[PDB]
C-alpha cells in the first residue's frame, strides 16, 4: 500500500495475489456450503428492521452469547409462488462463501417446516437511504467515500464471477465506523457467460436489462453511476411516478446534471451511464482500472479505504447494543411454523 502510494502500477501484482487467494477461499466454501448452523429457539425476536414480498428482516438476540443479529426470514411457500427458488438458493450459497469488509457477514443459516433463515451481523447505523433522504444530498467528497467502497466491493465480487444486480441506497448499511456494509444478495448470481433475468430496481436498471438483450457484470457499473448520481444530487438521474416512464428515460441515452456537479463528476457519470456497452467504464480493456484512475477519484487512497483507515464523513448515533433508532418502524407479525414440512424437495440444499 505504500508501494501503491509511491507510484500507480506497482501494486498490480499484489492486487492479483490478493484476489487469487480470495478466490481460493471462496471456491472452497462455494463447492461445499455450510448448512444448519443454528436453530430458531436459540434467538429472541425483538423488532422488524425491513420487509419484502416473501419475507422480513428482524433484529434478534442470541440467547447464549447476548450478541444481536439481523435475521432474514423467508416464507418457503411465498418463494415458490413468486418463482424465486433459484434466486434464494443463490443468495445463501453466495453469502456463506464470500468474505469482504464492505459486505454484511452471514453468521448462521437454517430452515424449518415453514421458513428459511439467514442470520446476519447486525449493522445498527441504518440504511444509507434513510440518511440520504433526510440530509437531502451528500457532498462530492462524502459521495466519493461511499463510491470507493462499492468500486472495491464490485472488484471483489466480479473477480469471483459474481453479479450483484441490486445496488441501491436501501441495500447499503452504515456501520459504527461510518463505512458501508452491502446487504440483500437476493438477485446475486455466479455466472461466467451472459444472463437474462429481468430483476433489480427500476431506477437502477441498465438499458440492456430493460431491452431484454442479455447482459453481464457491466450492469453493476451502470448501477454505480446511478448511485453516485443519486448520492450527489439527492435524486436519481431517471425518476417518474411509474416504472414505465422510468424505463423510457433510461433507454433514451440522455442525462441532465445539476449545476453544482463538478466537471470531473459529470465526466465519470457520462462514462458509467453509457448505453453503449463497448464504451461503458468498468467494461473496457482495463476494466475497473478506468474507474479507479478517473480524475474524480484522484484523491482516493484505495488501500486505505480497504484497510478502513480513512476518516468517515459521519458516524451514526449509537444508543448501545440493540438500538433500532436508525431504522423505521414496521408492522410486527407472529412467526408461524407449520406442523407440516413445506416445499422440502425445493430447498434441500439450503
Amino acid at each position: 500500500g505504500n508501494a501503491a502510494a509511491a507510484k500507480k502500477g506497482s501494486e498490480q501484482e499484489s492486487v492479483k495475489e490478493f484476489l487469487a487467494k480470495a478466490k481460493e477461499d471462496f471456491l472452497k466454501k462455494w463447492e461445499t456450503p455450510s448448512q444448519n448452523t443454528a436453530q430458531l429457539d436459540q434467538f429472541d425476536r425483538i423488532k422488524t428492521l425491513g420487509t419484502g414480498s416473501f419475507g422480513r428482516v428482524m433484529l434478534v438476540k442470541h440467547k447464549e452469547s447476548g450478541n444481536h443479529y439481523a435475521m432474514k426470514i423467508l416464507d418457503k411457500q411465498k418463494v415458490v409462488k413468486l418463482k424465486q427458488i433459484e434466486h434464494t438458493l443463490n443468495e445463501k450459497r453466495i453469502l456463506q462463501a464470500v468474505n469482504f469488509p464492505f459486505l454484511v457477514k452471514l453468521e448462521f443459516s437454517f430452515k424449518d417446516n415453514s421458513n428459511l433463515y439467514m442470520v446476519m451481523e447486525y449493522v445498527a447505523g441504518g440504511e444509507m437511504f434513510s440518511h440520504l433522504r433526510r440530509i437531502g444530498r451528500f457532498s462530492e467528497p462524502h459521495a466519493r467515500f461511499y463510491a470507493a467502497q462499492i468500486v472495491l466491493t464490485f472488484e471483489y465480487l466480479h473477480s469471483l464471477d459474481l453479479i450483484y444486480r441490486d445496488l441501491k441506497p436501501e441495500n447499503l448499511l452504515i456501520d459504527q465506523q461510518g463505512y458501508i456494509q452491502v446487504t440483500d444478495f437476493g438477485f446475486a448470481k455466479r455466472v461466467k457467460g451472459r444472463t437474462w433475468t429481468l430483476c433489480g430496481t427500476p431506477e437502477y436498471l441498465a438499458p440492456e436489462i430493460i431491452l431484454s438483450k442479455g447482459y453481464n457484470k457491466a450492469v453493476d457499473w451502470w448501477a454505480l453511476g446511478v448511485l453516485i448520481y443519486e448520492m450527489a444530487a439527492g435524486y436519481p438521474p431517471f425518476f417518474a411516478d411509474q416504472p414505465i416512464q422510468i424505463y423510457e428515460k433510461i433507454v433514451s441515452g440522455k442525462v441532465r446534471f445539476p449545476s453544482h456537479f463538478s466537471s470531473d463528476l459529470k465526466d465519470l457519470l457520462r462514462n458509467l451511464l453509457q448505453v453503449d456497452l463497448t464504451k461503458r467504464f468498468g467494461n473496457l480493456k482495463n476494466g475497473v482500472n478506468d474507474i479507479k484512475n478517473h480524475k474524480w477519484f484522484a484523491t482516493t487512497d484505495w488501500i486505505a479505504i480497504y484497510q478502513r483507515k480513512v476518516e468517515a464523513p459521519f458516524i451514526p448515533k449509537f444508543k448501545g447494543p440493540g438500538d433500532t433508532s436508525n431504522f423505521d418502524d414496521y408492522e410486527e407479525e407472529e412467526i408461524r411454523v407449520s406442523i407440516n414440512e413445506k416445499c422440502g424437495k425445493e430447498f434441500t440444499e439450503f
Binding site: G52, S53, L82, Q84, H87, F129, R133, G136, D166, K168, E170, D184, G186, F187, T197, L198, C199, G200, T201, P202, E203, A233, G234, Y235, F239, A240, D241, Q242, P243, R256, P258
Partner: peptide, 20 residues
C-alpha cells in the same frame, strides 16, 4: 426545480426490488 419535482413524485420512499 428537479428536486421539487422529485419530492412531489410517488417514488421518494423505499423502492421495492422487482422481478418478472
Amino acid at each position: 426545480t428537479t428536486y421539487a419535482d422529485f419530492i412531489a413524485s410517488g417514488r421518494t420512499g423505499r423502492r421495492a426490488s422487482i422481478h418478472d
